[model samples]
Target chain A: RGSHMMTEQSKKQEILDAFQFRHATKEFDPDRKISDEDFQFILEAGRLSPSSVGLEPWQFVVVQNKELREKLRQVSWGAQGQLPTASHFVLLLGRTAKEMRRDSGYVADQLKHVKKMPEDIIENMLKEDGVLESFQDGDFHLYESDRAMFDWVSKQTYIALANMMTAAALIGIDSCPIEGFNYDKVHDILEKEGVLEDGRFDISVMAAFGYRVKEPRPKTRRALDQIVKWVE
Target chain B: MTEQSKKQEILDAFQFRHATKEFDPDRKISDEDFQFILEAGRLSPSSVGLEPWQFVVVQNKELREKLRQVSWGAQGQLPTASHFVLLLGRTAKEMRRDSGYVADQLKHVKKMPEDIIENMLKEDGVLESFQDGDFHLYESDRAMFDWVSKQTYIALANMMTAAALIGIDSCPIEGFNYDKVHDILEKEGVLEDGRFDISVMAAFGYRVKEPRPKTRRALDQIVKWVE
Candidate 1:
């Protein structure tokens, strides 16, 4: 199909070009849309991104319906900025504070699915609570368990965000990295729709994807010499 | 090259990586070797594959000299390391805490070349109180600080660990002129959107040098087996 020649130089250039192409689009074409498979590809990228302790503390909520996008747009306008008119919006929700604890069924389900431990071993592990307890009293658990979850998930999201943006760029689709929005309002809307359980999910950030309506500005970044270091 | 492509492949494969702080100083990574390291970073997977970071490779000594100017002149590892890595954290300036105050403090500490010791002490003053209190008492604050701080460290550690896996030696370097870093990056205008600070710094290169013994808490002291 497209270029699949994988050489060291080509790979490196692909990454550089991808970073170069990614930017926050304040506006998007309303009529243009992303296909189901391409949208799924983006979702898959998020699924593959790493999480702290492999907790996978995130769920992706795609806003595709025009009515829903308009509603989310209202929330965005009141909270941060207007939601860009685009094909779809993706809401990245972090796991709730209660879910972080070891005793939570979420954690057990996660571990059991991955490890396939015997019931007794799982019980003992659950009782031990080493992994869960480790985050019990920490900053991530305390001040912004939501934020911690967001921060952890956001980093992973950023990685996926970067990948998807680049993938989009490669395919000529435009995207935006959005951190501006009202967490509570977004949560409220989702909760009302039964798309998310209140208090179980915290909104970390959102992204709008579609073809661009206007020309993107030239990319800007720090010089290589100023930011990079080598320690032998 | 030798008939070690398989061995090289294995070297490039899983579990072949570990963080390295010491370098052989006598040996330096060639341009090709360095490029390979950058390749891994470039290809590193991210959430949604958004690739939110840009890899800025600093290999020039002149730039290092300039960087040393802002890095508190901590010559210990800067000059000794094959390469010094400055990990620029995105501004996320709007996140909450005042970015101006934090950036100002960093500039103040690193800018006043003359007030190094005083600034160092002032910085340590905040840290000293935390250590003095009972661990249980500081649980809330400790958790918050650790959570926030570790986010940056996690990214740093990931890169370091990934570097190690690829046979690159890395040292997480915190010594640097914060303002200098800000000014330099600002001047270049390469700072990412919402990135307001530097998370941490690292040095990577082929080591022609050896490292001092690693000092760390014993496993029993640090980790408890949950059986």
Candidate 2:
């Protein structure tokens, strides 16, 4: 729930303060785990993120098992050893090549639940399209239709990640975004867990959440005057 | 300048955050402004809150310079945008298509008419296949390629708008060593931008001077909504 209760200045202050507080935590309190509610709140922020073609192409796998984390650390490039640790990790995965194109039951379920398309229309639509042929062909071309869907969905994920980080910061939680990891290794892990089917999904990136111990160093950036422009 | 002084929290808080290309030769961003920009990035929203990305901020000029060299000697003040914010985009293209699958799945669950389902699929299916190969080169893999490309752009758009809102001027830069960049970034722990080629690169900082007029196609010419 966003509050309009605060004056614009105060709200602005909150945002700015939050910005001031965020930093890449190189280290974390291994003992501390993010509260479930706070974690969910961050996830919700991502779910509500907007997209270009209304295609939501991101999924989350909450990795909390200690054994799994240990193995993942090898693939995550020592995130476990070097960085501030978290109670758990969240793995973001993208969908597979075949899943994106087929008019299978999967597509039907999403359209019905999320988009709310009618059943009669949905079924007839799949049937008339020769669903088998399309699904078999796969989706890997560079046309507008295909491009629009991917671009829009992918962008939406960033928006969500940003919102989640800010929300966590507001609540005094510490988080780190780890991009250095082995995708092939991550995929292998997911497949072993049954969380992902081979040729059906791709691993994106990982984020670690927890509490911090040491005070982070000062932030660094360019001056505002240098980066902006008035297009109008 | 790096004091823990409280400040206003406008979108400017984020936009004001710079992509320090060259440090003040003598000054560093007070800890305050640095944190402010990071927070702004954290607060940015996505389509489904899946939050698909990571960020690495490099404060060391040597490291930054190394990245700059790998990134094609970023043009126009790049040697100098205050901080180097490496925005990493996640893979989300396939999941989006999954939603489409769910849509089709629900049709069977609800027990809809065969013809209706078939027709709906026909229109969308044809469109989907056509979309898959609609690109100039017939050799490309339509689904995964398009998905990765689009996701990167979304990340680009968000960063640009966020920078703008905060008063930070950002240039989407793209000239760089694709293979080398992948090697550098991948070695650093962040995934590469993925199958999608680099959509654009952003250089954020305080302009040394005012920017020139922006060039573009006319609005009416570019925008059209069917009645």
Candidate 3:
């Protein structure tokens, strides 16, 4: 509806405008809240993002409880200004090897139940040409530890995180990705609250969403040439 | 912009995108569109604002052929795609809190205050946590690289999403021989003192083969409410 009438150049500019408008908002106006309609749109953007092998190995934990936000604030130095003030906070949970392994029930169920593939195709998909094994051991060396597998799947979460952030930006919502917190302590608090589903998932990252309270410092980035190379 | 119209715009782009497997070599992405896509990546968020990625666009037929030898996942894309990108992540040597790269970024790029930078790099500070705290990033070079590369995915996703918004197609390729591909780039002098590691890669162009269908889990299936 919106983009159909716009020229290709204008559509490109619109997306780029969203990129330029987004910043790591340190603090949000506590009085302002993101409407339910808009927040769900942001979540849908994340849910629909692409992932490695389409496994969708991440979960969005929307923490709206004031008590929980206060509890998280104690362990999350990275989100010190954000946790209690932002209108919405989300903890990204990544599936670990226990559920992400090639042979795990979660992986099988995703293919069998979610994708609705035939049993023969699912079995073939698992073992055919040693595809699953190579991804785990031979290629990426993800079979080394639970940590390795967790890290691998966690990488996929950031894709969703980016899409969600950009989607929010498109709708005039500000967000900050909080990666500087104490993971073990944060995990402990979430575990006590039964937020993690008993180790099937681990905290990958957290973000806060709402309207900014103050103007941010000037945005800074390396020049395009500094970060890119043209090999011709 | 009207709320409904804007919502429909982004959702349409998301639904329109797929992991395009083959490309129509006859069509090329205009420089304006490709640069817009790169701008999306350049402006994408990273942990600590480190900006830890290098975007190498391989336009040479020779290099793409050489790369095809080692990149098992990009066989179809290497020759047919109009633009191919190799995303590199800063290795531990440069990603370390005490590295000169960090100091330079803080001093020059971010133009952060000297006292604030000093405090950030001090013991039990923000930089110290990557090493001494729960992330355990300093445990090994591989660990640090992995963490840095994850940040690169933010850029990768943004770039792909940007391309989609402009009606372009793309494919993300992670299946490659890391050591061999590194050797190839190093031989070509692409490594530049070997400060980076292959994080991931992608191809962009017009699609030759139509995608079957896009599939994903339902919204409620993957999201939890803790209210």
For every candidate, what share of the true interface contacts is present? 0.05, 0.06, 0.84
Q: Measure candidate 1: CA RMSD.
A: 14.4
TM-score, cand. 3: 0.96
Best by lDDT: 3
Q: Model 1 segments beyond 4 Å from truth?
A: A1-7, A77-84, A115-129, A135-154, B1-227
Error of 1 at A184 (Å): 2.9
TM-score, chain B, predicted structure 3: 0.96
lDDT of 1 at A95: 70
Q: TM-scores for chain B, in order? A: 0.53, 0.56, 0.96
Winner by TM-score: 3
Output per-candidate TM-scores for chain A, rounded to 2 decimals. Answer: 0.79, 0.76, 0.93
Q: Cα deviation of B155 in candidate 2 (Å)?
A: 5.9
Listed models, DockQ each: 0.06, 0.04, 0.80
- RMSD for each model, in Å, please? 14.4, 19.7, 2.4
Error of 3 at A32 (Å): 1.5
Deviation in angstroms for A206 in model 3? Answer: 0.4
After TM-score superposition, what is the CA distance of residue B19 in candidate 1 from its true location, in Å? 13
> What TM-score does structure 1 among the candidates reach?
0.54
